[PDB]
Design a protein around this nucleic acid. Structure first.
Length: 53
RNA sequence: UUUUUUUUUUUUUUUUUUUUUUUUUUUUUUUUUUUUUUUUUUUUU
């Protein structure tokens, strides 16, 4: 019920439209996931994931 | 012609000092040369 897959939604602008002030979708709030994700990606020859914090 | 220690004397003989010391240790603290507001490819459509 968060319209995150919907074509033209407000969701992508939750921060700047001031709908939210603490994003659930952020990587700060998703630290473990962000890691494991980028790590696997890197082993799989990603260049994007190379410089991920 | 020599002489054949780039040896030498008079004792001597730590580029040893004793006065006590002896972390080029002080800490009252307090110790990521971390820090928060999201964020977190020196990503772009």
């Amino acid at each position: 019920g968060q319209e995150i897959d919907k074509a033209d939604s407000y969701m992508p602008y939750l921060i700047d439209f001031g709908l939210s002030s603490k994003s659930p979708y952020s990587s700060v709030k998703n630290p473990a996931f962000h890691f494991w994700g980028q790590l696997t990606a890197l082993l799989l020859r990603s260049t994007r994931a190379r410089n991920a914090r």
